[PDB]
Amino acid sequence: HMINKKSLLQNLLSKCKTTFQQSFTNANITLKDEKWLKNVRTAYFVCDHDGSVELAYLPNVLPKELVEEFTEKFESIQTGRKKDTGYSGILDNSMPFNYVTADLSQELGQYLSEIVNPQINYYISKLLTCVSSRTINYLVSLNDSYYALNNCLYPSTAFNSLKPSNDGHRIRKPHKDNLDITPSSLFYFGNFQNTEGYLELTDKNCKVFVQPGDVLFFKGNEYKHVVANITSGWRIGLVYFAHKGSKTKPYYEDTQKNSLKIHKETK
DNA sequence: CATGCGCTGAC
DNA sequence: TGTCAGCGCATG
Numbered sequence: 497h498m499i500n501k502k503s504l505l506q507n508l509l510s511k512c513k514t515t516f517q518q519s520f521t522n523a524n525i526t527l528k529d530e531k532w533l534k535n536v537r538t539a540y541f542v543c544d545h546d547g548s549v550e551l552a553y554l555p556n557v558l559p560k561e562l563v564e565e566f567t568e569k570f571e572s573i574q575t576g577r578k579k580d581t582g583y584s585g586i587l588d589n590s591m592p593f594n595y596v597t598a599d600l601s602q603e604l605g606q607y608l609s610e611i612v613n614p615q616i617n618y619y620i621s622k623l624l625t626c627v628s629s630r631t632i633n634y635l636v637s638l639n640d641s642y643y644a645l646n647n648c649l650y651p652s653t654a655f656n657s658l659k660p661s662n663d664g665h666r667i668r669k670p671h672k673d674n675l676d677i678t679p680s681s682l683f684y685f686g687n688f689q690n691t692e693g694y695l696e697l698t699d700k701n702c703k704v705f706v707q708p709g710d711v712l713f714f715k716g717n718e719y720k721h722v723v724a725n726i727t728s729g730w731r732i733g734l735v736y737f738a739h740k741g742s743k744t745k746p747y748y749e750d751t752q753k754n755s756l757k758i759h760k761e762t763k
Numbered sequence: 764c765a766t767g768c769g770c771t772g773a774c
Numbered sequence: 775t776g777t778c779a780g781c782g783c784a785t786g
């Protein structure tokens with residue numbers, strides 16, 4: 497009727513250590529209803545009474561060369577972009593169907609889908625096979641086309657470019673991601689200080705200090721969250737997520753406006 | 764740079 | 775016969 501924290505953490509760390517081939521020191525774990533650590537600089541897990549992981553933070557899982565390489569390219573592409581966000585894969589937003597994102601054909605989407613996602617997906621696989629099996633079991637039940645389009649288990653990738661003193665960015669405003677049917681997987685890039693650009697869970701009073709190469713697995717639909725400002729550097733991050741629509745709404749294999757016309761005549 | 768089409772939880 | 779801001783995406 498109640499899981500003991502000591503044993504569960506021993507198991508999660510054991511599986512993580514063998515899969516990621518690195519030891520996570522000073523790891524901690526807390527039930528979702530309990531008091532959460534105010535500051536997380538090390539491996540961290542939260543869960544419900546049943547023991548399913550609703551949050552997992554693994555520091556520095558990505559290899560240095562990989563993080564550095566993707567950072568230089570991201571910043572290069574983003575310089576030639578206006579908006580501070582981008583999306584690859586599919587989106588159902590504001591439509592009763594899943595559509596291919598506009599960025600996919602652009603330089604950013606091409607980079608994410610063809611180069612980045614295939615490599616990151618392996619680390620997403622490492623991650624889910626450790627902390628949450630139900631998530632990966634669910635993701636593979638989706639349409640074959642999504643996996644092909646985004647070259648990932650997640651149908652959708654969000655690209656967030658946060659420069660200093662930008663308070664207008666959607667990640668700077670406390671929110672839940674309410675269309676999420678599963679916990680998202682987050683990866684960080686760029687360069688910023690470890691006292692800044694942290695992810696704060698507002699209602700849990702918990703600050704996760706995230707750094708390039710770190711991974712964060714958590715439910716955005718349940719736990720309200722916000723990202724702190726940076727005074728220097730450049731904070732770039734990738735969010736792999738799945739909207740409810742991906743399972744429910746139909747898919748016309750085209751962009752938003754085109755998929756809409758097709759939707760009408762489909763009747 | 765404001766408006767139209769369109770969805771949806773949070774209130 | 776509830777309102778509305780907001781991981782889209784244009785058009786002028």
Ligand SMILES: O=C(O)CCC(=O)C(=O)O
Binds near residue numbers: 667716
């Ligand atoms: O950047 C982060 O750490 C969180 C971003 C996020 O929650 C989002 O993109 O909706």
Ligand SMILES: [Mn+2]
Binds near residue numbers: 671672673716721
């Ligand atoms: Mn979010």
